[PDB]
């Protein structure tokens, strides 16, 4: 083909080592080359390539472009890409319109459609970006494009306006339905504590979007603005670990404290069965905390079966989460992954690889780095699709959402309170073990973790 000159159309400049480089392998299922780096003009040309569609590149590009190109600049470049001039002067003009103009223009609309559908937050955050998108889509003329132009207008307008068999029966122990004032660790049913926390944690996990992760924004000074769902998910986790520690060390009577620790390990067992790894690690973090880890008189009295359950759970995190990773890979949804691993991998990928590659003195955007980030965000998304077949108990949910073990205390003051409580209830050797009065008027016997009805 005879494409126009570079002086009249920037995207016609031929490929070279100075403007585009590739990885050695092809896209597994498509047989398409993998772009390693390129100028933004070459990345835009390949985003809307005439020879073939490239959905993996489009998805990756739209998830990660904001580190090297502003949304306002992207819209300009795809509008410039759509305005293809005819070459300086038939058989040539008829094939150019059908094999270059029509496919490129259609790929631009596919980018616009995917942008408005999966990354609408760019438009929500910048009303002028949406104005320019609506203008440009209004200028598109052709029966070929009409169908795709109408689809984009429907997504825009919808974005502006904004399934199983029966779940198991809800489990009740000492506290009865509606007696919210008596809800506590030992009075609620251990099966139901685990189910409701798994539902809460599953929803917190599912609400985290790639916009909260790309660019490591949860670690930057605007984290509360840019990563609110992620930070709500982390804060719930931390809060539940502190609540378990607080339940333990504030139970001063040894026999009651043994019943408390034992009940938490039963909650852990149900979490393991539900594949709620976040919940498993909430419990493990509480058992491994300074105040709890040192309670030798409490752990001595724990039945062997529960010690082994806790020990296998503790092993999941050892050796850089080796067993946890193997296990998450071996299971199928529904599950609640531990988010922390992804956070470190995204951050270390972004900080350990350069933003730009240089070839013959020219700067190329390192796209492969961005692809690695998009692969981690894609893995996160794979686990957010499948919900749990468990019914919500509104009052238990509200009980766990409103837990606040720290109260008005700051972090240091509170963890110092937990540790000093631990020292009081089980003094360091050679101080003798004191006795403390019982605080629970109801029975300490657990109903177990086997469902009570068919």
């Amino acid at each position: 083909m005879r494409l126009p000159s570079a002086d009249v159309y920037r995207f016609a400049e031929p490929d070279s080592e100075e403007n585009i480089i590739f990885e050695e392998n092809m896209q597994p299922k498509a047989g398409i080359p993998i772009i390693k780096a390129g100028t933004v003009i070459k990345l835009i040309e390949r985003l809307t390539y005439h020879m073939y569609a490239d959905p993996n590149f489009v998805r990756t590009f739209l998830t990660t472009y904001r580190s090297f190109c502003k949304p306002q600049e992207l819209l300009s470049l795809i509008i410039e890409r759509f305005e293809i001039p005819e070459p300086e002067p038939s058989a040539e003009l008829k094939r150019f319109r059908k094999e270059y103009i029509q496919p490129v223009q259609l790929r631009v609309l596919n980018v616009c459609r995917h942008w408005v559908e999966h990354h609408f937050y760019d438009f929500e955050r910048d009303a002028y970006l949406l104005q320019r998108m609506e203008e440009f889509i209004g200028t598109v003329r052709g029966k070929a494009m009409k169908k795709w132009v109408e689809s984009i207008t429907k997504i825009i307008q919808r974005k502006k306006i904004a399934f199983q068999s029966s779940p198991p029966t809800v489990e009740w122990h000492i506290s009865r339905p509606g007696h919210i004032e008596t809800f506590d660790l030992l009075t609620l049913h251990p099966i139901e504590i685990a189910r409701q926390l798994t539902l809460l944690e599953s929803d917190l996990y599912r609400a985290v979007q790639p916009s909260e992760l790309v660019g490591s924004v949860w670690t930057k000074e605007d984290k509360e603005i840019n990563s609110p769902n992620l930070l709500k998910m982390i804060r719930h986790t931390t809060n539940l670990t502190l609540w378990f520690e607080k339940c333990i060390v504030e139970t001063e009577n040894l026999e009651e404290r043994v019943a408390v620790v034992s009940r938490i390990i039963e909650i852990l067992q149900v979490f393991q069965e539900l594949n709620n790894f976040n919940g498993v690690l909430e419990v493990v973090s509480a058992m491994n905390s300074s105040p709890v880890y040192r309670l030798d008189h409490t752990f001595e009295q724990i039945p062997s079966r529960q010690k082994k359950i806790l020990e296998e759970a503790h092993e999941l995190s050892e050796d850089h989460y080796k067993k946890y990773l193997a296990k998450l890979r071996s299971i199928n949804p529904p599950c609640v992954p531990f988010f922390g691993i992804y956070l470190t991998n995204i951050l270390k990928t972004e900080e350990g690889n350069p933003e730009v590659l240089k070839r013959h003195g020219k700067e190329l955007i390192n796209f492969s780095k961005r692809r690695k980030v998009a692969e981690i965000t894609g893995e996160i998304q794979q686990y957010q699709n499948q919900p749990y077949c468990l019914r919500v108990e509104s009052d238990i949910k509200r009980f766990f959402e409103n837990l606040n073990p720290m109260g008005n205390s700051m972090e240091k003051e509170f963890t110092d309170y937990l540790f000093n409580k631990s020292l009081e209830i089980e003094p360091r050797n050679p101080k003798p073990l004191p006795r403390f009065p019982k605080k629970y008027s109801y029975p300490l016997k657990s109903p177990g973790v086997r469902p009570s009805n068919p």
Partner: protein, 167 residues
């Protein structure tokens, strides 16, 4: 078997702490890191003629999981306490990181190094003398590193291994 040292990097988030271990593990000359593999955190080194393997844990990005730290503090043999020389709050946060480690280890003598990291071109707010005074009050070495040039990186990790060896 050669000795294995379990090292732990602790410090404030948002100030480039991850560059320390990334630079150690990268050979220099190669700028292509994958944190998903063993070789990204395990490194065979030779320190004072003695070969060893450094198993480095750096949970950079997980600082909000503030109730999950006691585990690695208990298992870690030596700690790199990292602050950014352009961020005073990260320097002021060291005291509590060291207090937690001491509590978890149940000891006032834990192998530890204070690391001042020059993570970008922005202005220095923590002078080397303040950091040297803090390190001396704790009885630990102080090492300044650059995230751009790799200067001091080797010295920070090797000094920590010497503190473990001499414990």
């Amino acid at each position: 078997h050669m000795t294995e040292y379990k090292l732990v990097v602790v410090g404030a988030g948002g100030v480039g702490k991850s560059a320390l271990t990334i630079q150690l593990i990268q050979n220099h000359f190669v700028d292509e890191y994958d944190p998903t593999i063993e070789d990204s955190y395990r490194k065979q080194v030779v320190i004072d003629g003695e070969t060893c393997l450094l198993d480095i844990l750096d949970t950079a990005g997980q600082e909000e999981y503030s109730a999950m730290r006691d585990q690695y503090m208990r298992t870690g043999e030596g700690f790199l306490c990292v602050f950014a020389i352009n961020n005073t709050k990260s320097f002021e946060d060291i005291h509590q990181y060291r207090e937690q480690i001491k509590r978890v280890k149940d000891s006032d003598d834990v192998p530890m190094v204070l690391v001042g990291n020059k993570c970008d071109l922005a202005a220095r707010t923590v002078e080397s003398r303040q950091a040297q005074d803090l390190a001396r009050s704790y009885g630990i070495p102080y090492i300044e590193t650059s995230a751009k040039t790799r200067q001091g990186v080797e010295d920070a990790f090797y000094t920590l291994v010497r503190e473990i060896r001499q414990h």
